[PDB]
Structure 1
Amino acid sequence: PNFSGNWKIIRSENFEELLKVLGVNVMLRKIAVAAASKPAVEIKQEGDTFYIKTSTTVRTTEINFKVGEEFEEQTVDGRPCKSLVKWESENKMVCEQKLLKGEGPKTSWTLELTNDGELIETMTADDVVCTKVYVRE
């Protein structure tokens, strides 16, 4: 699959609830789910090597990884973690995360490219799943 593109969000389900069950305070949740925080996602894929930039009005997040090689990022609540992405199937990657410091809920994410070119993202903490869907600009 080729995940490359500039992706715009078209569906978001259970995001604030994920943050809430994770202990994020209401002032921060409000900011995090406001229109000003609507994420635009740029992906550059070169085979198994990925660059993913997520942009909001106030923040840029950039990750660089190759499938099967450990890399650093932050969990959805901003805690540094060691991440590892594997292909679950031809069109879907899954990332396992390990906190660099301390214990905490089991967090993960996935990205899947559909036949008609939609991008499905999931983010999980224990038994709570958030789903976002994007289309290319």
Structure 2
Amino acid sequence: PNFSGNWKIIRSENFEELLKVLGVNVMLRKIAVAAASKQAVEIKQEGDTFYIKVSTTVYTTEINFKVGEEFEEQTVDGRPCKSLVKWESENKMVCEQKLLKGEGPKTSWTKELTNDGELIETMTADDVVCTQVFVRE
């Protein structure tokens, strides 16, 4: 399918819960929740290869990967991790991360194109699932 595009968030649920699992304290959790309101995702997909720029008001970060090939990124709370993205279906991919040092909750993320033109992105820590919905700008 075509993940490429310029996505703006319309909904973001359970983000505060996820940052709690990772040890973020209350006052900074509320600030990150407000930051997530302004999130944009830019995707260039050529075949199996994705270039993904995730950004808020004061921060931007680039995730370049190929389906099936290990790469390195960070978790939602900054720790470096090895990642591997695989398809689940035609329009959904899931990424499993493993920490490069130490220990912590089991983190992962998914991205899915819907039949209705939305990009749905979920990030998980152990049992807790944050769900984020975007539309093309």
* TM-score normalised over the length of structure 2: 0.95
Q: 1:37 to 1:118 in 2, by over 3 A?
A: closer
4+ long deviations beyond 6 Å: none
How many residue pairs end up in the alignment? 137
Cα distance in structure 1, aligned partners of 2:28 and 2:78: 12
Greater displacement, 36-45 / 95-104: 36-45
Greater displacement, 91-100 / 13-22: 13-22
Q: How big is the shift at 1:43?
A: 0.4
Cα distance in structure 2, aligned partners of 1:26 and 1:57: 21
Q: 1:103 to 1:35 in 2, by over 3 A?
A: closer
Greater displacement, 118-127 / 35-44: 35-44
Greater displacement, 33-42 / 54-63: 33-42
Seq. identity, %: 96
SS in 1 for 2:134: strand
Superposed CA offset, 1:91-119 (max 9, x none) = 10000000011111110000000112101
Q: 1:106 to 1:36 in 2, by over 3 A?
A: closer
Q: 1:35 to 1:103 in 2, by over 3 A?
A: closer
Cα distance in structure 2, aligned partners of 1:120 and 1:82: 23
* TM-score normalised over the length of structure 1: 0.95
Q: 1:37 to 1:61 in 2, by over 3 A?
A: farther
Cα distance in structure 1, aligned partners of 2:49 and 2:29: 32
8 Å CA contact 1:36, 1:57 repeated in 2: no
Cα distance in structure 2, aligned partners of 1:17 and 1:101: 24
SS in 1 for 2:135: strand
- Structure 1 gaps, min length 5: none
- Structure 2 gaps, min length 5: none
